[PDB]
């Protein structure tokens with residue numbers, strides 16, 4: 804679990820979005836595993852606007868943060884799960900690191916701010932849904 808709170812927006816993994824997220828829907832993209840909903844309270848997480856390929860992510864299944872080197876956002880094949888059929892997930896960045904399903908939503912950050920959230924994993928790899936291209940999150 805986990806979300807990014809920026810301005811009047813909440814960014815979560817689309818497969819973990821709640822009834823309240825869908826009732827206050829701003830934007831969603833199944834191909835990216837992202838959903839953004841509106842909030843009444845002001846959020847002040849800050850989004851990175853950069854091309855960093857190193858950062859630190861939070862891994863809830865270890866209660867620890869790990870440093871990672873990660874690939875540029877790209878279209879990556881993701882195996883079928885109970886949430887989606889087998890498909891290409893876009894804007895996904897992979898790194899070598901630990902993750903379990905419950906780790907989705909953990910933030911990846913660089914020195915500039917939030918980069919993305921854990922979205923996929925397996926076999927010692929972890930994948931992060933990038934949010935740096937969503938300029939409207941802080942217009």
Ligand SMILES: NC(=O)[C@H]1CCCN(C(=O)Cc2cccnc2Cl)C1
Nearest residue numbers: 836884886902903904922923924925
């Ligand atoms: N973005 C998706 O399609 C994910 C939906 C939930 C399921 N997905 C996973 O990858 C779950 C997983 C398995 C083993 C280690 N880490 C993780 Cl995060 C895929």
Ligand SMILES: [Zn+2]
Nearest residue numbers: 853855913915
């Ligand atoms: Zn950066």
